[PDB]
Amino acid sequence: PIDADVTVIGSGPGGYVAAIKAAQLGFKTVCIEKNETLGGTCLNVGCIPSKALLNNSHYYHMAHGKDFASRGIEMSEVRLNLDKMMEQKSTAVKALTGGIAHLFKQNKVVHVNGYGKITGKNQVTATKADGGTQVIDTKNILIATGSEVTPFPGITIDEDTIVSSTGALSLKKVPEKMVVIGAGVIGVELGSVWQRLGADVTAVEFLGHVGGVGIDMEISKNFQRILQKQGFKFKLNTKVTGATKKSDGKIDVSIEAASGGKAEVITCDVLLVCIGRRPFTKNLGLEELGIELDPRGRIPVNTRFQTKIPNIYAIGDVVAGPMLAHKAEDEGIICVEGMAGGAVHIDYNCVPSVIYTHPEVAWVGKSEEQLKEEGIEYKVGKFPFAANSRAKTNADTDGMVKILGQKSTDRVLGAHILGPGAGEMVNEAALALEYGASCEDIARVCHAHPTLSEAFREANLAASFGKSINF
Template sequence: MASYDVIIIGGGPGGYVSAIRCAQLGLKTACVEGRETLGGTCLNVGCIPSKALLHASHSYHEATHNFTKMGLMGKSPSIDWKQMLSYKDDVIGQNTKGIEFLFKKNKVDWLKGWGSIPEAGKVKVGDEVHDAKNIVIATGSEAASLPGIEIDEKIVVTSTGALELGKIPKKMVVIGAGVIGLEMGSVYARLGAEVTVVEFMDNVCPGMDLDVSKTFARTLKKQGLKFVMGAAVQSVETNKTKAKVHYKLKKNDKEDMLEADVVLVATGRKPFTDGLGLDALGVALTPRGQVATNDHWATNVPGIYAIGDAIEGPMLAHKAEDEGMAVAEVIAGKKGHVNYGVIPGVVYTAPEVATVGKTEEQLKEEGRAYKIGKFSFMGNGRAKAMFAGDGFVKLLVDAETDRILGGHILGPQAGEMIHEICVAMEFGASAEDIALTCHAHPTCSEAVREAALACGDGAIHA
């Protein structure tokens, strides 16, 4: 039995980052992970492999739709699905091995197996029990389903199964128009599948700025995705090779059905805390089954902390990473901090969508006076040269102080450009601060400056 200052349960983005930071702060640290590789859902069956397929499918789209426009002539490429999956697996391997290397470099012990907490101060892995002055629960989340739907990961799949399909389906139904559903749906649509998205709410990515959401949906429709909005899925029937999705429209109770080769259930995720023994320990949970924590990520049981998807807040890898570093600082006796008002969210479709801070709907609900600065990518030379003129940058700023309250980008490289707005918000900057900052030309980032100018006397290229 080994004794540690900290044992982190879970080797995903929150867990492995927290373990590395704990070790860097001089704490004797171990990380419990039952998978064969580190990195959790994100690196193994989530963020990283999905981005590999998004990149591959986007490259295929460029080759078949835009190459000849640029004078790049020749036979259009064909899809070798087996090789594409192999490429995806290679990307996973490079990343997960990298985490294992970082553990060795920082002297973090990897306790291989599934962990439980038999009592405060002890973590059981397999038949061994280890002492720990502090325990961090970083066990992440799992796919949530709907009543009447049985997941087999072959015909009816979660995001995990969608990354390992035996072949590209001719018809796919995606249940849920959130980030996962739209990303994976766009992958298969680009590769030739007929994709229909069924969503209970009236807009894609519910909670997103409505202006962005509506334009985003129109853009995806132009790319061939079909949408059935305001529809409640009742059940999914399957046989050996096909599925039937039965749904009811909310507006008139009309029932209908869609046939598909594959059904992707993308109805969100839920905390994964099974097997930890939290009930016996008396660890408090929220009504939604999340681990309840205070402002320092501590549970009601002394010495036990929780971070990431297991607790309240957006289920984002980078939110978990921030909490992982912050809780390490707290355990080491320092001041850990996460600014929850400046956590970006990105949808990695083409075009990308990136958001941070308040939406216009939230500001209206708060009764806060605000200004809007908006600039279309059709006015951006670099974007037009890339066949990426769809979309816009939208800044929301305080009407009196000009301080940036939120930023929303639909367009090329949105996931990279959002961080300029994030940094500005972190420093309490005004739109004028961005407007007065020289931006290289020609870049897509100039659209952010133009949106900032639009908050004042007006954009130049609008």
């Protein structure tokens, strides 16, 4: 029987960071993880392996395609060694998951391997695989149990030929033809990986836009345009009625228009299902505690991330807000800081989103659609990467930066980046929004030349002064 001040259930970005932070704050901290490794979804089957394949497949596309030839880099034959590519991804995951174990040891966090159940208001019971149980008597419980793939009814995932994101990250061979259910962030990234590697990729989406929820519509349409020129095909406003395996091993996917009619069937070697991810709370003990989930399966919490039970907290994918790794990390920190008497506030408006395709997509703050719905009057500033010096020097000119500013105060309300380096660039925008910078304020910052970030500067100038220098 272990006693601790804070017991964290889950070792994903929210849990493992929260556990480290609590230990650094003087709490006696225990972290419970059922899986064989730490790091949760993001490290093991999420951010890390997908970004590795996006990076590796992009370079393959550059070598196999015309890009390197245009720069005087001539290759007689370019062939794909998928095993070695997957090996590079695996090397990264193992290095990072091992790093978490090193960090837990460094900060005196106690790692418990088992399935954690809340058996008492102050106790958690961890059941090991052999059946052995470890009991933790604890002042505070931090729930960071995360998410799972949302199943598609009538379509059964076998991680062989009908795959979730996990299976798509480890295909043993490039499928000749692949269908993706869901054109959200995960679907678009994974389809693009396999599309670059030679697969014929179609993504089927019930909604009318690509990129998931909260993405600016102009950005979404331009993003789709570029992806379509790459060879990514889209069926939007389209419903999937069912999928059936066949004797030949191919899969027939039956679809219909979302409004109705237009029945059709399409075939593939691999079907990837990414209609979403949902909060995971099974066999946690919430049933007995009287903690009621919201209709979407998330745990309700107050501003301090407290459940109705004051000493039981929840953070990350399991609660409301964007289901992102950096969001879960910050919630874990402020929640644990709140346990130490700190004030707790987060504005999900300042949580950025990134799509690691090429071109990348990144945004923070509000979209034009959000501003119109909230009745806020704004002005628009745009700068295309075709006019950016570094993008032109790199011969990589897709996309633009779009800035939304408050009409009178010039305050930056949203930043949307479609093009090279969007993922890193959005962090400059994030720093600006957190402290309420104006468009003029960013325009007056001396940005290094030549850098992609100058497109961000000039877009802010356009929103503020009405005109850019280089466009």
